[PDB]
Symmetry: C2
Subunit: 404 residues, 2 copies
């Protein structure tokens, strides 16, 4: 038969879901990474009043024109503005941020002035408005500052705080149930029975889920018993928006698990044109969506990263999405490649004698090892119908995000 | 004159010692923590020779006979075969199940045809095909991760494959924080004459937590010398680092500078950078001090390029201490003055041609904080360079996850 393209599989998945709308209001310090549920519209002008941008003296243009020294009637600070008398022929010592006096027309740097006996003289011309930041020049009251669907980071939260807003409404955390199946799987700190190995995928998915801002319900390991498995699915579906199998449940093979899966929902089993991996299951349970990952650790991790991650992004209500961008760079390592599959190989991005990045391999790309995720810092995304690439050619690279 | 940024950082780093106090935590609670000791594998991974496919385990001599081989038994995942395996027969096996005693090869189901008197093999069989060997991944005894390794999704699951549930990591860095000034007001409160909302304190708090530090926020302190002294004593009493987000002298001779000079040994630098320049650093009775300038743009840049690396060393992280940069061509004409290393904000994107190029976010004035939302990278302009035209190369430093 034939293999399904990755963007095809992805677009197909995304067209089926609806982004959550349930919200909750939280103080700013608790919002890193949360999604805005509604537009943030400013109740005030920013800045709130005409203020000084420099340390210096505030004056009236008609006073400069005299050519004669102007005595300091007073001084104005941001913490305590001046409100005394400001008679004609005089100036005011003003600091950064302090509001401008009654009829001030400009602010002069402390550097472009000379102290006289009983007054201050200014050297260099003075233009109306110099060193004066005006009310509303940055933000207008009634204007939309950040649109709904915006992921909040250090770049926008402090801005929201300059508005005087202490709490904001955000979409609730996406709830994800997760578990693994297999008589060969053992828990941490327990002895290994005949033919057993330690469960690793579940911890990997748990960690990524938490760093992505989701709320995780980890149900542990379920042994190969038809009664226990059905009960696990029903419990997981009951309390979450998404249910994920980190390994053990069929992604195509006709075994006892595939039967239970199909009785509980409408599932699709795909054969993707990727490497490593290939099979992937996705479908609708009674009260949630289902994602089933392949058993191989390398394949499970790559599959979660490129399909489940963006799936969760749309569900959270985030409008900006597509994952990290890619760039073309030359390779310094011979790479082995076979046509027919988009091969996400691991490598190492680095600087060249000149200053531009170049990528090396991490070693073998088998799925019999996991260490390449640690050594490398990026994905070398080799085109579906391409073959082996030699030193010097161009390749596309995708730097790892913060999960690695 | 001025002090280069390399000079300031080096000075700072040479003065401090990384933390060594440790605590043990389960794996699921270790994201971003620093491994305190070498992790040594007590097992072989895999722990046994097993099949890589769903199919059949056989002997080379049986295949050579050319006759079909009936099934003598089966091996399941976690249910291996320990029964009889007579000459002229084969054993059924699944992915990940261990190979029976004496197995020489594994054949996938598709290179097979079910006959009436046994299973027939249709392809050539090479010795060792489709058998994963014990230890091919991790040998018992080896050191898997050295002390100093920052733990992420890349290493924690590997540790789990060893059967280890918890590991020892360095304690979190404790950082106290506060701002000062009669003009600062708290969120959800009315602004009096000349007041503005405190913005710097939140910025720092946010970055500190994302970097894995334990934050101790003391709030806003009014211009009162008695309250200032109390804030310093309190902060210094339970912290590794103390930070003033704004309001305390970075060089100017006011009442706050006097207090600073009274409680510790501080230095007031004037850096050759833009935006900003002033920065305060020194030693208090039980901690290190970092004083940021008042302008929001200056404080954030200053914290990012100087305070961030200092906290990295303190944490015990042994990873590189080199900002990741690269040279690209600019697509905007940049205005630059000789004499200051200018950390302008810009936008990196693919040209229709496929390679990266950067454009400005717009006006690089410090009176605004928006360049951080619009941009996704810094444009690090050499200290002595002048204006630059379209087509010239420049150094760019992509933003990390704090932005
Ligand atoms: Mg199984
Ligand atoms: Mg002040």
């Amino acid at each position: 038969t034939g293999l399904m393209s990755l963007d095809t599989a992805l677009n197909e998945m995304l067209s089926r879901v609806t982004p959550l709308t349930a919200q909750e209001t939280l103080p700013l310090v608790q919002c890193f990474g949360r999604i805005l549920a509604s537009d943030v519209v400013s109740p005030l002008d920013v800045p709130g009043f005409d203020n000084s941008a420099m340390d210096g003296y505030a004056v009236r243009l008609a006073d400069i024109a005299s050519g004669q020294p102007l005595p300091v009637a007073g001084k104005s600070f941001a913490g305590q503005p001046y409100h005394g008398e400001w008679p004609a022929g005089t100036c005011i010592r003003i600091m950064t941020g302090a509001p401008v006096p009654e009829g001030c027309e400009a602010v002069v740097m402390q550097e472009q002035t000379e102290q006289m006996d009983n007054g201050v003289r200014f050297t260099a011309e003075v233009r109306s408005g110099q060193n004066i930041r005006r009310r509303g020049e940055d933000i207008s009251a009634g204007a939309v500052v950040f649109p709904a669907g915006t992921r909040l980071t250090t770049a926008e939260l402090p801005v929201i705080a300059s508005l005087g807003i202490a709490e904001v409404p955000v979409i609730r955390k996406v709830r994800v149930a997760l578990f693994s199946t297999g008589d060969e799987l053992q828990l941490p700190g327990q002895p290994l029975g005949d033919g057993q190995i330690y469960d690793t995928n579940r911890l990997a998915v748990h960690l990524m889920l938490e760093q992505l801002g989701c709320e995780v319900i980890n149900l542990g390991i379920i042994r190969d018993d038809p009664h226990a498995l059905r009960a696990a699915f029903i419990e997981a579906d009951s309390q979450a928006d998404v249910v994920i199998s980190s390994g053990g449940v069929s992604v195509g093979e006709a075994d006892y698990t595939k039967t239970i899966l199909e009785e509980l929902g409408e599932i699709a089993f795909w054969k993707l044109a990727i490497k490593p991996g290939k099979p992937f299951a996705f479908g609708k349970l009674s009260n949630s969506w289902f994602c089933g990952l392949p058993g191989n650790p390398v394949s499970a991790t790559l599959t979660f990263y490129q399909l489940v991650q963006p799936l969760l992004a749309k569900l959270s209500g985030n409008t900006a999405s597509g994952l990290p961008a890619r760039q073309r760079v030359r390779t310094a390592s011979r790479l082995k490649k076979t046509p027919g599959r988009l091969d996400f190989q691991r490598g190492v991005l680095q600087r060249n004698a000149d200053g531009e990045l170049e990528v090396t391999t991490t070693g073998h790309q088998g799925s019999h090892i996991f260490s390449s995720f640690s050594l490398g810092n990026c994905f070398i995304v080799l085109e579906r119908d391409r073959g082996n690439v030699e030193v010097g050619e161009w390749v596309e690279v995708e730097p790892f995000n913060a999960l690695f």
